[PDB]
């Protein structure tokens, strides 16, 4: 079996994406944030203390014949500002674009951090990336792809995210006719929880490719591209009048510069981010500052290569035995 769902930006930066998910007998459909980052599938519900729902759609485990509270298991999710997401569990029936998963973990959030709240376009996340970060107490649970790997007739999905425009997740299949060229495969490591790679270089507009390895993970639900100190102020010294700003919180550029394009390596092919991608628009509303689309991952620990880079490639999250990772031009 095999499943496609159409994933759209929620608003005009591309700031995330949102993919219509049906939940429940019958279905109530979500639109929910799928994150290659997170294990944890978890939406806004009719527990959700009223204060912190605005305008989200809530899913009712009340009203679905086939939801079941999981006696006594619970769940908590934090984040880097200190704030933090919890509730407690269901079993319910979900289905994503055809495919559908029965005794799936519905975590029922029932108080959210203000950051999800202030977002009425995100009802929830499903999360993609391996099992052992999931956060259920005491019984840990399955992602929707471990429950789903069964049934697809290959045990893969894969990303197609648009630039200012829809895209596609796909599971169960590669549609050939998405991509250009031949798909290059690279080894994953699963020993963090997350689809951890090694790019092989990088390269700033059309300068020299730079052979070196930079260890990061692919990330659905980061905006950005984060990448070590050394690199990023590399591509930056490219563009005149950029200058990393603590008030802000990073690298910004004057609005009227033409970003050049930033080269990632897999293997011995090469992605390339054309400039526009790394453009997030004014710091505020009338500034000429803009916001830039690849910061410093030195506060953070980790690198990511979030939906700037991954919407320039079609890539594939391999879930064999021993996983990896395709990426082809598209």
Same mark, same amino acid.
């Given at each position: 079996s095999t499943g496609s769902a159409t994933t759209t930006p929620i608003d005009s930066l591309d700031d995330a994406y949102i993919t219509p998910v049906q939940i429940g007998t019958p279905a109530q459909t979500l639109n929910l944030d799928f994150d290659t980052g997170s294990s944890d599938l978890w939406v806004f519900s009719s527990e959700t203390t009223a204060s912190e729902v605005d305008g989200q759609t809530i899913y009712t485990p &009340?009203? =679905?014949?086939?939801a079941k509270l999981l006696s006594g298991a619970t769940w908590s999710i934090s984040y880097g500002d200190g704030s933090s997401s919890s509730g407690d569990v269901y079993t319910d029936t979900v289905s994503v674009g055809g495919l559908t998963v029965t005794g799936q973990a519905v975590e029922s959030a029932k108080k959210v951090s203000s950051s999800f709240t202030e %977002?009425? !376009?995100?009802?929830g996340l499903l999360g993609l990336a *391996? &099992?052992?970060?999931?956060?259920? =107490?005491?019984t840990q649970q399955k992602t929707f792809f471990d429950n789903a790997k069964a049934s697809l007739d290959s045990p893969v999905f894969t990303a197609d995210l648009g630039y200012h425009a829809p895209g596609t997740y796909n599971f169960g *299949?590669? %549609? !050939? !006719?998405?991509?250009?060229?031949s798909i290059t495969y690279t080894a994953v490591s699963t020993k963090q929880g997350f689809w951890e790679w090694t790019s092989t270089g990088y390269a700033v507009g059309s300068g020299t490719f730079k052979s070196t390895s930079i260890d990061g993970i692919a990330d659905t639900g980061t905006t950005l591209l984060y990448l070590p100190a050394t690199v990023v102020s590399a591509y930056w010294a490219?563009? &005149? $009048?950029?200058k990393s700003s603590s008030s802000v919180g990073g690298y910004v550029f004057p609005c009227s510069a033409t970003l050049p394009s930033f080269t990632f390596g897999v293997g011995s092919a090469r992605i390339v981010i054309p400039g526009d991608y790394i453009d997030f628009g004014?710091?505020? !509303? $009338? =500034?000429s500052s803009c916001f830039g689309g690849i910061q410093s991952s030195a506060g953070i620990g980790i690198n990511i290569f979030g939906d700037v880079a991954l919407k320039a490639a079609f890539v594939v999250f391999n879930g064999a035995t021993t996983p990896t990772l395709g990426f082809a031009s598209k």
């Open positions: &009340s009203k =679905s014949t086939t %977002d009425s !376009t995100i009802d *391996f &099992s052992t970060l999931n956060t259920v =107490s005491p *299949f590669i %549609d !050939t !006719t998405a991509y250009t060229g490219q563009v &005149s $009048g950029a004014p710091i505020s !509303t $009338g =500034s």
